[PDB]
Design an enzyme around this catalytic site. Structure first.
Site, short mmCIF file in Angstrom:
data_model
loop_
_atom_site.label_atom_id
_atom_site.label_comp_id
_atom_site.label_asym_id
_atom_site.label_seq_id
_atom_site.Cartn_x
_atom_site.Cartn_y
_atom_site.Cartn_z
CG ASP A 60 -1.91 -1.21 1.17
OD1 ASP A 60 -2.91 -1.16 0.42
OD2 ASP A 60 -1.68 -2.20 1.89
CG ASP B 223 -13.23 -5.33 -2.58
OD1 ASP B 223 -12.22 -6.05 -2.69
OD2 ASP B 223 -13.20 -4.08 -2.66
#
Length: 244
Positions: free
Chosen positions: A11, A123
């Site tokens: 990230d 997701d």
């Protein structure tokens, strides 16, 4: 025979990895390259104003200083952005919310750069006993069944599915092998299991459920799981992995 892949997710934010700093993404990626990680995923969350330029500089640096397959994503909303990133050197881009809201986007990327260049991050969450797709970083139930979306995603030309189970993401509790098993027979595409990685045995569980790759972040960045040991442990348990 294909090796199952171990993937590290970095990230990134403003040019730096984030755990408060976490090193330079390039040099942390170089590190992962050398200790046995198979591909990198970089997810950007920089602010929109410097984001286009920032991600592009990242991709260029990673492409000419590391020699590992890698994917970039985070807020890729249109073909032009994906195109810039691929031509700057990314092997693949990840799309998610923009994929769900504009499925043609998958096809435009695939027809220009090949389906191998397109990863659709899905997701999913179980709501009232049915697998549902969520957009906006797992916050919006779309009303689209996981079963229908994976099939449409393959139909549209995607090259790979990055499957995160919203319940497990951010826990170290384990991969959601029930969802993998649910998706595995619905699509021919490679499946990256994402969300829940706690212990070496978790990776085994995911690959037995049918995953093709296994993604994690903290457990690797915290020198908290050793990739070599994971791979040796994976091998001993009969799973094809790329050693050294």
């Amino acid at each position: 025979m294909l090796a199952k892949r171990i993937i590290a997710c970095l990230d990134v934010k403003d040019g730096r990895v984030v755990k408060r700093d976490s090193g330079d993404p390039v040099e942390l990626g170089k590190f992962y390259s050398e200790i046995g990680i198979d591909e990198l995923v970089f997810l950007d969350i920089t602010a929109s104003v410097e984001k286009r330029k920032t991600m592009l500089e990242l991709v260029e640096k990673v492409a000419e200083q590391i020699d590992i397959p890698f994917t970039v994503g985070g807020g890729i909303h249109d073909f032009e952005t994906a195109s810039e990133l691929i031509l700057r050197g990314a092997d693949k881009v990840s799309i998610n919310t923009a994929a769900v809201e504009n499925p043609s986007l998958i096809t435009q990327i695939a027809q220009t750069f090949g389906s191998q260049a397109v990863v659709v991050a899905i997701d999913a969450k179980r709501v009232d006993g049915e697998f549902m797709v969520f957009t906006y970083s797992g916050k919006k139930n779309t009303g689209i069944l996981l079963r229908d979306w994976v099939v449409e995603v393959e139909k549209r030309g995607a090259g790979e599915i990055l499957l995160t189970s919203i319940d497990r993401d951010g826990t170290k509790s384990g991969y959601d092998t029930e969802m993998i098993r649910f998706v595995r027979p619905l699509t021919t595409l490679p499946i990256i299991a994402s969300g829940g990685a706690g212990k070496m045995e978790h990776f085994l569980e995911a690959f037995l459920a049918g995953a093709d790759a296994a993604l994690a972040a903290s457990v690797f960045h915290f020198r908290e799981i050793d990739v070599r040991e994971l791979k040796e442990y994976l091998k001993k348990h009969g799973v094809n992995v790329r050693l050294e």
